């Protein structure tokens, strides 16, 4: 019964609650069920240390909390991130749910420099989103 994971995190403004956190053998990672304030339900890869009960939000006004998803430009330098988007509104294509969360190193103009766990460094457009936390 392989579940549907939300790698888009586009329910901006609408608060959600970590309903549960379970393992997904098809993803060799944990996933969480999120119940949103509007009735919608969605699964997400559960960052490290995310617990049942905590709130989740996405978008420019989101709080900088593990599990929250925001455009790279709205994220504090030094924060660890995963499920990094390469193209605004195309969902995350980098660190989706396996590996090691990258890290914001600097913000320049319309770019956000990020160092992948491989020491690799990339300057992604701030418009691209990423989830706070360790995968």
């Amino acid at each position: 019964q392989y579940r549907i994971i939300d790698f888009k995190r586009d329910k901006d403004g609408i608060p959600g609650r970590v309903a549960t956190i379970e393992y997904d053998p098809n993803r060799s990672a944990n996933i969480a069920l999120i119940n949103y304030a509007d009735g919608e339900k969605r699964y997400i890869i559960a960052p490290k240390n995310l617990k049942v009960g905590m709130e989740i939000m996405s978008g420019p006004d989101a709080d900088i909390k593990i599990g929250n998803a925001l455009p790279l430009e709205n994220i504090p330098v030094g924060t660890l991130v995963h499920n990094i988007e390469l193209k605004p509104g195309r969902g995350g294509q980098l660190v989706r749910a396996a590996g090691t969360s990258a890290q914001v190193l600097g913000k320049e103009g319309k770019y956000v420099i990020v160092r992948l766990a491989s020491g690799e460094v990339r300057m992604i457009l701030g418009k691209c989103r990423a989830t706070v936390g360790e995968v």
């Binding site: 420019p60 006004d61 709205n74 103009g109």
Partner: protein, 149 residues
């Protein structure tokens, strides 16, 4: 043969680059690729008219940018915003907000592309933003970011 160049000149010589081209060749190549046209006394006067209107327009525009620059320099846009950390904002005030508050409060509809903001305003206070109303007309827009909530 005199000819009215429609295209291939300094970009588009369609303004009215009237040059005497070799007859035949003209009507065999230029006239063929729509590059030039017969310098008939009708399509010559008809050209004059377009150049005359293009010249009037360019002047209206300049005159408008100039009056518009006067209206702007008397205003003060007021954008309230959530701040905390020593006046520091939670988000950033950019060209679209500024453009919007300008329309909403002053009745001016300006393209945000003209608001020459560099780095997005991320702090409470006053900021003089340049506005490029025209190639040779820039005005100073005073923007005022106030703490809300």
């Amino acid at each position: 043969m005199k000819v009215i160049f429609l295209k291939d000149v300094k970009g588009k010589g369609k303004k009215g680059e009237i040059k005497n081209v070799a007859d035949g060749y003209a009507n065999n190549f230029l006239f063929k690729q729509g590059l030039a046209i017969e310098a008939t006394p009708a399509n010559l006067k008809a050209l004059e008219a377009q150049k005359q209107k293009e010249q009037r327009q360019a002047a209206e525009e300049l005159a408008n940018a100039k009056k518009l620059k006067e209206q702007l320099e008397k205003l003060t846009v007021t954008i309230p915003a959530k701040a905390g950390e020593g006046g520091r904002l939670f988000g950033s005030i950019t060209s679209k907000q500024i453009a919007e508050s300008l329309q909403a409060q002053h009745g001016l509809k300006l393209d945000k592309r003209k608001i020459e903001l560099a780095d997005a305003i991320r702090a409470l206070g006053y900021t003089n933003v340049p506005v490029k109303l025209h190639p040779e007309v820039t005005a100073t827009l005073k923007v005022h970011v106030t703490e809300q909530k």
